[PDB]
């Protein structure tokens, strides 16, 4: 297992230029390229990327193209200019992953033994964290699937490096931002938090209204794995939990009551120090 990947901010931008290359067609043309990273640890790194030609139809999603010859030569150039770097996987720009997206992985597992994808989003209509990545395993089921083969969710985050923090945050000056503001980000974080809570509930009832009535496969997936979600649901206001808020919140109230009691005295120093300096500079001037 890999259990997270680390994505530098040079990519997430070296994808979007290639979406901007062929983006004159407008309607739909998925970008697929080649991902470059480090055979690091259990934890893995992502550094560079480049593109590859790819087209695919609308019906019969089995007609698709990865130029191997283009993949051999251009990676042979990047191996030539950079010996530290080697391949780790691939990416595509599609907002939701398609049905075609498993045979692309089944091609290039002969390049890296654990070839990992990264889905990005050129248009995150979700205001939350984009650019999530998957990995394929086999999970052969009680039903009798010969090979239950579906990707697994892997957590991810945006990497950082000393040179690229210079160039990125120089370009952040085109908009205003409060990273220095204490508790102004924090109040937004529960706003950005609970917006994520409401977004996942409006999606799950749309799945749940369809599978209730008329049309969907009712299968022994989520419908009881989501039943376990209801099983936790802590019973918050009950017998002894009341003695957890009235023995611990009032601890943190005293520290705030201490902090106000000094902050008022500190601001009272600035009165007398100004009122002495006010009239005594006046009474010697006159």
């Amino acid at each position: 297992a890999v259990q997270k990947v680390v994505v530098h901010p040079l990519v997430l931008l070296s994808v979007v230029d290639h979406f901007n290359r062929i983006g004159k067609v407008g309607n739909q043309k998925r970008v697929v390229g080649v991902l470059l990273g480090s055979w690091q640890k259990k934890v893995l790194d992502v550094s560079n990327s480049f593109a590859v030609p790819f087209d695919e139809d609308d019906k019969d999603d089995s007609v698709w193209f990865l130029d191997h010859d283009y993949l051999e030569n251009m990676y042979g150039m990047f191996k030539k200019v950079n010996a530290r770097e080697r391949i780790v996987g691939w990416y595509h720009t599609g907002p939701k992953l398609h049905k075609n997206d498993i045979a692309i992985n089944e091609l290039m597992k002969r390049y890296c033994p654990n070839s990992v994808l990264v889905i990005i989003d050129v248009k995150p209509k979700d205001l939350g964290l984009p650019t999530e990545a998957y990995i394929s395993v086999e999970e052969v089921h009680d039903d009798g699937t010969p090979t239950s083969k579906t990707f697994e969710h892997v957590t991810s985050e945006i990497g950082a490096e000393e040179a690229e923090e210079v160039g990125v945050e120089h370009l952040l000056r085109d908009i205003k931002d409060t990273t220095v503001g204490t508790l102004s980000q924090r109040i937004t974080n529960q706003v950005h938090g609970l917006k994520g809570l409401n977004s996942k509930l409006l999606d799950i009832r749309s799945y749940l209204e369809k599978v209730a009535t008329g049309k969907l496969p009712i299968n022994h997936q989520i419908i009881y794995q989501l039943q376990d979600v209801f099983n936790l649901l802590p019973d918050v206001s009950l017998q002894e939990f009341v003695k957890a808020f009235y023995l611990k919140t009032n601890d943190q109230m005293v520290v705030v009551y201490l902090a106000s009691l000094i902050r008022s005295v500190v601001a009272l120093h600035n009165l007398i120090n100004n009122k002495i300096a006010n009239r005594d500079a006046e009474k010697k001037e006159g």
């Binding site: 005293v254 520290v255 201490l258 009691l261 000094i262 005295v265 009272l268 009122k275 002495i276």
Partner: protein
């Protein structure tokens, strides 16, 4: 002599054992800062009294 965390009962003939809480430290350091804040207002009290 604090060799033991217990309590006795004459009307029961019963020894009862309890544990020790390490809690009482925030409130202890709280009131001593109030003793220091008592003097800095006194230091401002004659400062306004000596000159307005």
């Amino acid at each position: 002599d604090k060799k033991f965390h217990g309590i006795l009962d004459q009307g029961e003939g019963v020894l009862i054992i309890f544990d020790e809480p390490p809690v009482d430290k925030t409130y202890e350091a709280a009131l001593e800062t109030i003793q220091n804040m008592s003097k800095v207002v006194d230091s401002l009290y004659n400062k306004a009294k000596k000159l307005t």
